[PDB]
Amino acid sequence: PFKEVSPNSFLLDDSHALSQLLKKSYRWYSPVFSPRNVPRFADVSSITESPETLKAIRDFLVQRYRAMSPAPTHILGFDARGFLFGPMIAVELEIPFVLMRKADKNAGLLIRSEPYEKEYKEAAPEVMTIRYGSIGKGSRVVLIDDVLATGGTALSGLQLVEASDAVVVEMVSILSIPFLKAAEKIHSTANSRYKDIKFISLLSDDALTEENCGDSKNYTGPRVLSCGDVLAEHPH
Amino acid sequence: PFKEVSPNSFLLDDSHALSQLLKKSYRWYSPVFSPRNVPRFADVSSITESPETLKAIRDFLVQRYRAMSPAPTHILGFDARGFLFGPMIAVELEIPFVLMRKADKNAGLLIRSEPYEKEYKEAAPEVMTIRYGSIGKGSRVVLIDDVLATGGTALSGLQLVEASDAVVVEMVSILSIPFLKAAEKIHSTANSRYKDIKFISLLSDDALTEENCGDSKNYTGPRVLSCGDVLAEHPH
Numbered sequence A, B: 001p002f003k004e005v006s007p008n009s010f011l012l013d014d015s016h017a018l019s020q021l022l023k024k025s026y027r028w029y030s031p032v033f034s035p036r037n038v039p040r041f042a043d044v045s046s047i048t049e050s051p052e053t054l055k056a057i058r059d060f061l062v063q064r065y066r067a068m069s070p071a072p073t074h075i076l077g078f079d080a081r082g083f084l085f086g087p088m089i090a091v092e093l094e095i096p097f098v099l100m101r102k103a104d105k106n107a108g109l110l111i112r113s114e115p116y117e118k119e120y121k122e123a124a125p126e127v128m129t130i131r132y133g134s135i136g137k138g139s140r141v142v143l144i145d146d147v148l149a150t151g152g153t154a155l156s157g158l159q160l161v162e163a164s165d166a167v168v169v170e171m172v173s174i175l176s177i178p179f180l181k182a183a184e185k186i187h188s189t190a191n192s193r194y195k196d197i198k199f200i201s202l203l204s205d206d207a208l209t210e211e212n213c214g215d216s217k218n219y220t221g222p223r224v225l226s227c228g229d230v231l232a233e234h235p236h
């Protein structure tokens, strides 16, 4: 079951088989071995490449929503890591999977989000969109992405669902980074207007240790190799 | 069943329930209503938002690979639309789902593709990657994306799989644009080196008509609206 770690922010109890499997499967990488400048970049591939882990996530969330009342009407996944988990859940629940993407990636008449201004050195906010009418009045939307870090896109999701005259069921993530206080900030911003938004995570990055480090030890070459270079390494 | 429309390029017979469902569900948009400058941009959302269609695709491809011999060992999906279909198939087949993304989106030691030089006015080629070792020697990889248009990323997929000392089972797409001759070009380029690569599609864009047009008729406003603008349209 989900335990309330802070107001309206829940974490799957670590005794659960899914929590255990995630802790076992996850691999994180330091800057020199990752695409982002964060201490530990939790690779979604370590999850999607693990058949047992992917199935465990699918089974758990599907059961969750089938048991939920009133049931969700839509799953809204974030480009692109949310696309990895949303469709496999939506296909079972037999509900639409909507895509939240930047305007230059989405088709049709779109609705764009209104991110807050950045905070000195703090990365630039992304304007995200959904096609106008993809979610209608009365819709109960489940928001999904792999990692809840700063929560910028999570906020875009909330804005888009509200503007659509719909309600957010909950913001779900495979992994949360509690240190970044995304849930805390979203729950207090603009006079606690999103105080009632529920956040659920399957694993906290605090559960990840050095055993989860995917960095190549004692490696001194480049991070990226060309196919030609790799081809030369074996008889072909 | 799949019919050979040209050498090593197969199209699902249009009598099939899946082909029919795709023709019914698909929605395309003209430039003023899309993010790309192509006559008819086939929106992947028209597929993912259709529960019955998404399930039909999942069921069909899963059955295909379970019946296949030797069976595929990996599913490699293209960022980001391939991420929408790959995981739901891989979870059933209980095999890894690998991600092909640009270097600045992927983690770990990566292998990058070597795209051909562009052709006057013809859009710039994308260097794509996969984590080194995500696919090993002996792996039989199924490549997936939603639309097979120019085939630039398809070629990146082939290069990455070959460099990994693995073999491509087939390049699968929900929709193909035969006019762009991606399969034909890939099958002849570099002295027919990829002649044996199989391409399969579930629907040809030739099946899409004006009835599939998602453009707002007699509309004169902007393509993108802000949440604030949409909020003003209803009581809140």
Ligand SMILES: Nc1ncnc2[nH]cnc12
Residues within 6 Å of the ligand: A036, A038, A040, A041, A042, A043, A147, A149, A150, A177
């Ligand atoms: N995968 C990830 N791990 C840690 N912080 C992140 N911020 C954004 N993506 C992240």
Ligand SMILES: Nc1ncnc2[nH]cnc12
Residues within 6 Å of the ligand: B036, B038, B040, B041, B042, B043, B147, B149, B150, B177
């Ligand atoms: N969705 C799409 N439809 C038509 N041509 C495309 N080229 C790239 N994506 C396309």
Ligand SMILES: [Mg+2]
Residues within 6 Å of the ligand: A078, A079, A145, A153, A154
């Ligand atoms: Mg995001």
Ligand SMILES: [Mg+2]
Residues within 6 Å of the ligand: B078, B079, B145, B153, B154
């Ligand atoms: Mg592509």
